[PDB]
Design a protein around this ligand. Sequence first.
Ligand code: BCL
Ligand code: BCL
Ligand code: BCL
Ligand SMILES: CC[C@H]1c2cc3[nH]c4c(c3C)C(=O)[C@H](C(=O)OC)c4c3nc(cc4[nH]c(cc(n2)[C@@H]1C)c(C(C)=O)c4C)[C@@H](C)[C@@H]3CCC(=O)OC/C=C(\C)CCC[C@H](C)CCC[C@H](C)CCCC(C)C
Ligand SMILES: CC[C@H]1c2cc3[nH]c4c(c3C)C(=O)[C@H](C(=O)OC)c4c3nc(cc4[nH]c(cc(n2)[C@@H]1C)c(C(C)=O)c4C)[C@@H](C)[C@@H]3CCC(=O)OC/C=C(\C)CCC[C@H](C)CCC[C@H](C)CCCC(C)C
Ligand SMILES: COC(C)(C)C(=O)C/C=C(\C)CC/C=C(\C)CC/C=C(\C)CCCC/C(C)=C/CC[C@H](C)CC/C=C(\C)CCC=C(C)C
Ligand SMILES: CCCCCCCC/C=C/CCCCCCCC(=O)OC[C@H](O)CO
Ligand SMILES: CCCCCCCCCCCC[N+](C)(C)[O-]
Ligand SMILES: CCCCCCCCCCCC[N+](C)(C)[O-]
Ligand SMILES: CCCCCCCCCCCC[N+](C)(C)[O-]
Ligand SMILES: CCCCCCCCCCCC[N+](C)(C)[O-]
Ligand SMILES: CCCCCCCCCCCC[N+](C)(C)[O-]
Ligand SMILES: [Fe+3]
Lengths: 240, 281, 302
Amino acid sequence: FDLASLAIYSFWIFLAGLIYYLQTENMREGYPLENEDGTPAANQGPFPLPKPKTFILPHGRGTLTVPGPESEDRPIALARTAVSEGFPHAPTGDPMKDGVGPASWVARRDLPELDGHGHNKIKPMKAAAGFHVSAGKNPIGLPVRGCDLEIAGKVVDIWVDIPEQMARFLEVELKDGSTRLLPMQMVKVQSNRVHVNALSSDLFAGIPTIKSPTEVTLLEEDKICGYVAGGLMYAAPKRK
Amino acid sequence: ALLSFERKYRVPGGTLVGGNLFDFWVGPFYVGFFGVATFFFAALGIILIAWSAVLQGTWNPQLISVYPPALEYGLGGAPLAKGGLWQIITICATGAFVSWALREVEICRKLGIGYHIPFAFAFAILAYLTLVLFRPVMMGAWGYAFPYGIWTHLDWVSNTGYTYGNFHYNPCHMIAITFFFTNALALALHGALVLSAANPEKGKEMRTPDHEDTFFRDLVGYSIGTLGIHRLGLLLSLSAVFFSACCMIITGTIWFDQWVDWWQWWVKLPWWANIPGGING
Amino acid sequence: AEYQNIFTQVQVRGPADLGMTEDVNLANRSGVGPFSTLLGWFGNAQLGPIYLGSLGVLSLFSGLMWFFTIGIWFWYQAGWNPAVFLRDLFFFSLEPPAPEYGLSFAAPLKEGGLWLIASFFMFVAVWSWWGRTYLRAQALGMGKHTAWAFLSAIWLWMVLGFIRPILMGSWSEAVPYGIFSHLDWTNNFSLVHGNLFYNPFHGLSIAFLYGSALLFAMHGATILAVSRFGGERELEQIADRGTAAERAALFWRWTMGFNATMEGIHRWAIWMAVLVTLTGGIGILLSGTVVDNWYVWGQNHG
Ligand code: BCL
Ligand code: BCL
Ligand code: BCL
Ligand SMILES: CC[C@H]1c2cc3[nH]c4c(c3C)C(=O)[C@H](C(=O)OC)c4c3nc(cc4[nH]c(cc(n2)[C@@H]1C)c(C(C)=O)c4C)[C@@H](C)[C@@H]3CCC(=O)OC/C=C(\C)CCC[C@H](C)CCC[C@H](C)CCCC(C)C
Ligand SMILES: CC[C@H]1c2cc3[nH]c4c(c3C)C(=O)[C@H](C(=O)OC)c4c3nc(cc4[nH]c(cc(n2)[C@@H]1C)c(C(C)=O)c4C)[C@@H](C)[C@@H]3CCC(=O)OC/C=C(\C)CCC[C@H](C)CCC[C@H](C)CCCC(C)C
Ligand SMILES: COC(C)(C)C(=O)C/C=C(\C)CC/C=C(\C)CC/C=C(\C)CCCC/C(C)=C/CC[C@H](C)CC/C=C(\C)CCC=C(C)C
Ligand SMILES: CCCCCCCC/C=C/CCCCCCCC(=O)OC[C@H](O)CO
Ligand SMILES: CCCCCCCCCCCC[N+](C)(C)[O-]
Ligand SMILES: CCCCCCCCCCCC[N+](C)(C)[O-]
Ligand SMILES: CCCCCCCCCCCC[N+](C)(C)[O-]
Ligand SMILES: CCCCCCCCCCCC[N+](C)(C)[O-]
Ligand SMILES: CCCCCCCCCCCC[N+](C)(C)[O-]
Ligand SMILES: [Fe+3]
């Protein structure tokens, strides 16, 4: 048993200590584990719950402490399909409208995300002085087609991540002249149309609306995004 | 058990094979058809290693070595104790890996997320298949594959590379290495950058993403962006493994000599032919 | 062709972003630079601005002098021939002093003394750049993780060309300045020391270089799989979990039985990479000093 022997055995004891640190750090959300009725689970594993930590949030938004008491802060319209644990929970209503499965949102902060200086991070381009399409097919004015191949509206604006200068949303003008937002990560921009494989046209109006025309909350974003991604599962009866 | 937010995601749907028949979880582990399959393929392969272990006569993980068939079996088959076990085991592993990426795909469908992950894994599968299938077949024999041993597969890397002088001079080997280093450089900076913003100095509020951009602009003069660093991380890691796969598939089939000889193409070039001076003149 | 967020579809562009001030000495901060439409296909198009104060300038000065010291030695070894210079560019090499010069600094210029002078210049470029990566983070109210993770890489570097040759007793033991020559040295080093594949800190360094590539493929793809919910906005997901983070963790929990948080995958990531050269540094410091033959030693011990 030499210095290199000592060394390597020590590194593996460190290493086990480091994995123990990292797993528990990675338990600051979602823990403790719950039974399928949502009460504390009997068994939690070997790794303990981590000691709380706090983040002081900028712009006076307060403080976050994790792990804190977890609650979904939202009605979950779902129900056990099975007596013993491990099975699907089937949606009791319209999963898309109700926000479950691939349609889930989180009760996020109903405030908009702020940049370093305290202005809204996201703004529709025609509220963002100086912003313009700089390359690739500029999509404003384009008809928006869903997976039923029928048109749902026409693009009126691009909603941009200012600090980072990226298209995030297409604002889309529907049959009644109102608009919804469409994630940029979920559309195909083509020379003559914007195609949205996630939703059929008839569903475009079930996109959750924003309570203001030149900002969007994280709560809103989350509803708007999970619903569009929920169409991959739920509007596939109409995908041909 | 469940994460306190997991319940609303455990919906039926998204299966690719078998409808709802396998749509369930075992503890935290989703099942689905391909977890059935993964289990089958990986269960068989582990038995046959245990077999291949009782023939060798040792139950020590550090000595167990499943060897590929002899060079002299070409691409045929072999008895179970002369390569046949390596051949089936290779088939269960390939089944287990492909199944694993496909089960991941069902999980991407149920959770409604991108298919980026099982596509990135599939590069690891190409790498494996390159060493155990594409390369040995092109060379004409399974025996050119690496054995399933903890230390014997490092001897295989050793023996193989020193067949070409120094495998360092393989120009695709250096591109793969450059990508692997740069991936690690980037994973270190990128985790350090987020942690430096999530956990600022004492007596400070949690920093913002603009604080992340300015750090790197101050530091090197450019911030790739929070979406770009993740594309960069993915591009970096997959490129390493794709050039590994290149560097090996061309070694033995279309290049045979000391890999350093390849670099006579630059030296003997005509516009500095025979000059007196330097290392090579 | 369901779009995959690998390349941008529509680049947009507005006023340059000047960045946070906090406590940065704006006097030492350059103006903002051009916009690369070409780099906008993959990430941010904006180029600059950079900080450049006392530390950065000292760093780039010596860093250049290390580059112009090695280069002029190449220019000499090529007979100052601008064609012999490009021919053998990857074959030229600034070698440390021969062993019997020991750690003496009286080794002549053409026979080791020049290696000592570039190595001084490079020593200063790195450490005052390291000090820069730290102060850049102070000026902005950020934790120091960047400088700490960078001291991990410095560590194996200080080991190769400084710490280990000292403990071996001569400059000859250091790594020559040359493309191919430093690879030859890396091959030689494994043979001299009894196959490095059997140096158990090397076999750890590999697991982490590999695992560093495993983890970023894992993480980079996950964040792109959940960018359709703003998943790359990691701070506010850390601040305030959104379905993006919930969906990221559950893919992995269902897939392999356990999962991270949007903060904690960054701790896995910083450590996975950092450990690459922490272990790599230890295994090299120990070669020739405490362990002569790593293969034989693998038989004595384990
Ligand atoms: C004596 C040794 C030779 C040499 C000979 C070779 C040879 C020979 C090869 C390499 C290869 C590699 N070399 Mg070289 N090489 C040398 C020097 C170096 C040096 C150095 C510092 O000097 C470096 C950094 C490298 C770098 C590398 C990479 C380019 C590459 C390894 C990664 C890879 O392929 O992943 C690819 C990834 C995989 C194969 C992993 C696939 C995993 C599968 C899909 C999943 C497995 C799951 C498992 C069964 C699960 C267990 C259970 C769960 C854990 C619960 N070489 C010297 C000169 N090198 C290899 C290569 O390019 O391969 C393509 C290769 O064959
Ligand atoms: C890549 C180019 C070469 C190669 C060259 C090297 C070199 C060189 C080294 C290794 C090292 C390792 N290699 Mg190898 N190796 C290759 C192919 C593989 C394959 C494969 C299916 O293709 C696997 C599973 C492994 C596995 C491993 C481990 C023994 C070890 C650490 C890897 C690691 O952390 O990776 C990153 C992955 C992770 C961090 C995730 C966890 C991975 C776990 C540990 C893999 C477990 C495999 C298990 C022991 C066997 C299967 C169990 C079965 C049920 C029987 N190698 C090819 C042939 N490999 C190192 C070592 O210590 O060797 C002794 C080392 O020095
Ligand atoms: C034939 C060759 C030998 C061998 C000999 C060596 C030797 C010798 C070494 C390694 C080391 C490494 N080996 Mg080995 N290795 C072999 C086989 C392999 C194989 C394989 C598949 O066969 C692989 C994957 C590896 C893998 C690796 C890595 C795990 C490790 C390097 C970490 C790193 O990032 O260093 C690269 C990173 C750095 C060097 C850090 C640099 C930090 C500095 C401060 C940055 C300076 C920048 C400079 C100023 C320039 C700035 C310029 C301006 C920006 C323009 N080895 C065989 C057996 N290997 C190293 C190690 O640690 O071993 C324990 C090492 O030194
Ligand atoms: C987890 C460890 C991994 C890692 C980590 C790591 N490296 C780091 C960091 C971290 C965490 C930093 O914070 C630090 C940094 O600043 O990052 C941006 C860095 C860094 N890692 C670097 C390199 C590097 N890291 C490597 C490896 C790795 N680093 C590991 C894989 C490697 C290799 C061999 O694998 C290299 C080469 C640098 C980019 C940087 C350290 C910079 C430094 O100190 O530089 C001093 C030199 C200068 C300031 C100037 C040099 C000038 C040139 C010599 C001139 C040549 C140019 C020519 C004259 C130009 C002509 C005109 C032009 C307009 C064309
Ligand atoms: C391309 C970039 C990197 C990459 C990516 C990557 N790998 C991945 C993923 C991704 C994105 C996954 O989604 C997937 C995963 O689930 O990760 C946790 C995976 C994964 N990468 C893993 C390992 C791994 N990846 C590696 C490499 C890489 N993975 C690249 C560097 C390496 C090495 C050596 O570099 C290893 C060892 C696993 C943890 C996991 C896949 C787990 C899996 O497939 O499980 C199903 C199979 C089983 C449970 C058991 C199979 C048993 C066999 C039938 C018997 C053994 C056969 C084998 C050939 C023996 C090997 C013996 C050794 C001595 C060689
Ligand atoms: C256009 O041409 C001109 C002339 C203008 C050029 O500028 C061209 C220049 C070049 C072509 C140069 C290119 C350089 C290379 C090809 C060399 C590549 C170098 C490497 C790969 C380095 C490999 C590793 C080097 C290491 C490990 C260095 C370690 C450094 C030490 C830790 C520093 C320790 C310092 C010491 C010992 C100094 C001692 C003295 C003191 C006072 C402290
Ligand atoms: C094409 C040539 C092939 C070689 C590959 C060339 C790429 C060079 C990479 C350098 C890594 C250093 C920069 C990457 C690290 C960025 C850190 C980070 O996390 O960035 C977040 C963002 O910038 C703020 O939000
Ligand atoms: C190399 C990767 C393996 C590291 C292991 C990290 C933690 C694994 C166990 C986590 C426990 C999760 N669980 C089941 C308690 O919820
Ligand atoms: C990877 C790209 C390199 C980034 C480095 C950019 C340095 C910024 C300097 C911009 C100069 C501005 N100005 C107008 C004073 O020239
Ligand atoms: C050196 C002066 C820096 C200021 C110049 C600003 C460059 C932006 C020019 C926009 C051009 C876009 N383009 C054509 C490059 O794609
Ligand atoms: C911080 C992440 C922890 C991941 C550690 C992975 C351990 C890989 C085991 C490789 C074994 C090395 N060795 C030399 C003992 O064979
Ligand atoms: C550390 C390298 C290989 C070891 C195997 C990986 C650890 C097991 C990960 C799965 C744990 C899930 N579980 C059962 C705790 O819930
Ligand atoms: Fe990230």
